[PDB]
C-alpha cells in the first residue's frame with residue numbers, strides 16, 4: 001500500500017500488545033485487508049485497540065477525523081474525507097462493534113481506504 005515502512009515500527013509495540021490483549025491472529029488482519037470482515041471481537045477489538053493507540057478514537061470510539069486525515073497521504077485525504085462524510089459518526093453496541101460498523105461502511109464505499117496494520 002501507500003503505508004510507508006516507518007509506520008510499521010511506529011506501531012510495532014502497540015500491534016503486539018493489541019493482538020495479545022484480544023487474541024488476534026495475523027491471518028485475521030490479512031482477511032480484513034483482503035476485504036473479508038466479520039463481527040468477531042478478536043479482530044474488531046484489535047482495530048479499536050490500534051486506533052486508540054494512535055489517538056484516532058476516544059473512549060467511546062468517536063473518531064478524531066483530523067488526526068485520522070493527517071496520517072494519510074494527501075492523495076487519499078480527499079477520498080478519505082468523502083468516506084468519513086458517509087460513515088461518521090460511529091454507532092454500535094460497544095467500541096469493538098462501532099469500529100466493525102465503520103470498517104464495513106468504508107470497505108463497501110472505498111476499497112482503497114480501510115487498511116489494517
Ligand SMILES: CCCCNS(=O)(=O)c1ccccc1
Pocket residue numbers: 047048050051054056071113114115116117
Ligand atoms: C483508516 C483505517 C484505520 C483502521 N486501520 S488501523 O486500525 O489498522 C490503523 C491504521 C493506521 C494507523 C492506526 C491504525
